[PDB]
Amino acid sequence: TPEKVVNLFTFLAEEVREILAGLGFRSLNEVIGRTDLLHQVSRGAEHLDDLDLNPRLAQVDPGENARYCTLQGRNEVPDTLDARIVADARPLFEEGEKMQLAYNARNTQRAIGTRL
Amino acid sequence: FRKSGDRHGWEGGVIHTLQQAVTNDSYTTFKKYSEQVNKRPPMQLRDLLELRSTKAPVPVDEVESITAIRKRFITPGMSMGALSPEAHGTLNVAMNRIGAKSDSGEGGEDPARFRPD
């Protein structure tokens, strides 16, 4: 039943809310990228050599760019010959008639004829 | 035209060359056509003019695409009364297919043609 999955995700978010409130923050953006909030506790009775988890807590300073920051929308990409076609073939996309086009093709141009 | 003299612009050999080159798609044949046409002794004003420049030649790939040139030519009007409807329709279809502007003429146009097939 989908209601089961809805309730499952509701419960997960509820627990996250509770633990984050108990921690002392107000949102998730305030915690992503922070490793100076974790600590290591060991099992003394096992006597094994303590697993050196220290490198997993190595924190490098981000500088000016935030640790979580990300731009909006997908990353851009240069245009190929396809653009030159979609401007010269607009009568096709407005009326739906036959078309015959001719061009010169260099090797640098990639994926000729996918946007159309 | 007669074999005696009075050179013309369209003789038999040139017509056959153009027709074979356009029906066989052999661009080399069209080049042979153009060489046959330009080789004739002067007959018009535009055969008394040479063209030169000063810069270095540029490889043919840098010249703008063929379609940006084909979209410049037009087909002058031809009345539907003069030529049969078949030729009119064929010209219209071809020119509107490559993207240029064809012409109707004086004899008007059938209304049933005002929509794409």
Curated annotation (Swiss-Prot), chain A:
Signal peptide: none annotated. Transmembrane segments: none annotated. Belongs to the glutamate synthase family. Aggregate of 4 catalytic active heterodimers, consisting of a large and a small subunit. Disulfide bonds: none annotated. It comes from the Bacteria. The lineage of its organism: Bacteria, Pseudomonadati, Pseudomonadota, Alphaproteobacteria, Rhodospirillales. The chain holds residues 1167 to 1282 of 1515 of the full protein. This is Glutamate synthase [NADPH] large chain. Glutamine binds to the large subunit and transfers the amido group to 2-oxo-glutamate that apparently binds to the small subunit. It comes from Azospirillum brasilense.
